[PDB]
Amino acid sequence: AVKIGIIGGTGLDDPEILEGRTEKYVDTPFGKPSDALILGKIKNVDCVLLARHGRQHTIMPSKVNYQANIWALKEEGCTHVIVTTACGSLREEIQPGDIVIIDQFIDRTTMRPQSFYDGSHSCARGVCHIPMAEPFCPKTREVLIETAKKLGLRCHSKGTMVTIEGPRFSSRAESFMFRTWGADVINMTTVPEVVLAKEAGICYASIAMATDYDCWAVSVDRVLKTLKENANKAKSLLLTTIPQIGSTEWSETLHNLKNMAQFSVLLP
Amino acid sequence: AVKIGIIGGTGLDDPEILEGRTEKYVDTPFGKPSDALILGKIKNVDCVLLARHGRQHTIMPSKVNYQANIWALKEEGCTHVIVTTACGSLREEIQPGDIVIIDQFIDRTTMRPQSFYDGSHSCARGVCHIPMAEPFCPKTREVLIETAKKLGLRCHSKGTMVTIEGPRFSSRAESFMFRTWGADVINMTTVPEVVLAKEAGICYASIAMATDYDCWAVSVDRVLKTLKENANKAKSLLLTTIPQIGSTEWSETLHNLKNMAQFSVLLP
Amino acid sequence: AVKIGIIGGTGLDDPEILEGRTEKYVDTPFGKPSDALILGKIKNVDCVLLARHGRQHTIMPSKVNYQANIWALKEEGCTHVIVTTACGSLREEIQPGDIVIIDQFIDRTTMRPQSFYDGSHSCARGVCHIPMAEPFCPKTREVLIETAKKLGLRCHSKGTMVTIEGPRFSSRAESFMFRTWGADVINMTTVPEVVLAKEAGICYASIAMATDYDCWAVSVDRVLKTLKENANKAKSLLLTTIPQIGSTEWSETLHNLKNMAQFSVLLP
């Protein structure tokens, strides 16, 4: 049995995606999640939807409580967490409207807690050095890629996301630099979301939707405009991918993730 | 009508630059500015001078209240903000004593608020994603460049400033690395000063004075020594540039900046 | 007369290394050190041992009070500070088990105070811009290198340490990137430890022990396993190096360090 947590990004968090919906506000040892959890289903698969920036989008990337969001989904029983995020393209071949099933990231954030084990919560004691060689779940990414193919969607099978602190967009000099570092797309929320999901032993995958070419011309209006035009893609991908995940066995994948997380903790 | 805000850097904030001076201490929703605002004129142009590190230079780069400084200048009616800053040269052709009218930056700071919209001030509500493709005002930079030419000063027409957190200087390994990233000069205060000026809809330009070659030998004494020897250059440049700015029309430039800033804000 | 402060890293802080031991808990203007100071000797040389993460290793890298640790050693009279640290190798020639007498660093940390002069302690007033061209003491590194040679140990004479914030390990994309930046080894504690030692006018050197190849496969268990197998090397190196340091004259070296630190401070 699996339960899919879904974190929706800017203009990519439509509750209508789930049937038999029920709102549920929760609390965690790390504070309150961005907004209430929406419990529902996609076919016969249990899901939990959460708006990363709050349903009215009032939380900037730097201020999102990533710890609470991941902890709440974990506490709810989620075995998987698939998210959506807008991003700028740092590669000509990645055109706005394209989906990128990212497999790597480059951290450029500075003021964000990246671990549950901060030595101040009973629920998570000790020091945790979580491995990040493969930040995203390969099995989940695989089904997303195949499903995108079945839907005839322009989709890139891999990509490195550079996550900046924000809220400002990058300067042109930074944009060029990120390209030399091997970054393919850029956003403000992948890190530490992917890191905390790992510590929680959750299969995490990200559906990145290119909304602009950054500036190597990006603006809020341009991003919102592209998201509005392409939101249906991520929705369709999730609706078709989730039932597939629910039809396969994950016991082993989840076991290996649990072990990796457990053995990354150093106790007193 | 224009009003020029001038933020003076280390040993580059001489109040004598303005005539008909008047001291004015102010407060802002983000706290107190580094020091009192000095109101005065350069020819027929109204100006507002502010010492970035306080008149006695007691504030380290990491601790400068960039938000309050920019907000105070904005509240005072400034349409432009031209600043001075010492910096290390990362390029052989940029010799100590040379002026660099920077046009780009690379952020390496880590503990600095970079937006007025931090969701805790009525004066600035919502989330702001300010564009940084062109961080500095091209029209202002243009007049600075031409004026430097008329003054016969060694001046570089462009350059990328890498702003480090400090207060320590860079290691040699970092110095070499910055060069590979395309950085031309290095300092500790350009970011987030330039970013906040943008959010405020202000035309911002920076007069960077190379004071050393970093270490790709830099020391406090070396920087102070070079600044003392070349301070007159920035003063003369400002005195000659400002009247020129006041003689041209900026209504359109300021309108486009206001629009960019306004449309970068996402309301609830 | 010299006094060697020794900061022991993960599984590299054996108090048995000193004879005539005496435990001593202290306080500093910056708070409490990671654990009690252990006073003792190695031959005829006075030493002070301190466990970076606490004797039970309960402090994550981001939370170590580097200021208090360095200040306590300084207050105790230490002229030198030699430390041990595990690290990942970013170079094929640097094999796990190898020692690296690092000479440079690249900062990737984000939430760490890096100066004693934060404008809130009487003991350190003003603004300090400490030079970092040569972060590590060349004379101390020289004796460590020669001693390693006399012990027949695989030892690299130089290397650039990239210090990440942690507590998570790097992603593969970050690992590759660090290699392009010229980094040779990677850890989570060199910065700001080396910076604060410099401000304190202390000769600082680091004995880096490669424990893995990062991921360009690293895990907590792998690191602990390698450290357990090679801990004896760092211990032997320290035991043999320290008496040599005590047999030479450092008055001039220490004088130049004191001057550099003193002249890096800007008073009101």
Ligand SMILES: Nc1ncnc2c([C@@H]3O[C@H](CO)[C@@H](O)[C@H]3O)n[nH]c12
């Ligand atoms: N070129 C770009 N650079 C950085 N972030 C973004 C984004 C993402 O969309 C939002 C900003 O418009 C924010 O959540 C960020 O993660 N779209 N395009 C971007």
Ligand SMILES: Nc1ncnc2c([C@@H]3O[C@H](CO)[C@@H](O)[C@H]3O)n[nH]c12
């Ligand atoms: N090589 C260098 N690296 C970093 N900052 C500076 C500076 C600037 O001058 C001051 C330090 O001396 C500080 O305000 C910083 O922005 N001059 N030379 C520098």
Ligand SMILES: Nc1ncnc2c([C@@H]3O[C@H](CO)[C@@H](O)[C@H]3O)n[nH]c12
């Ligand atoms: N590949 C690697 N990356 C980052 N840090 C480390 C370390 C160091 O060892 C500890 C983590 O296992 C921590 O103190 C860190 O500084 N070993 N291997 C590492």
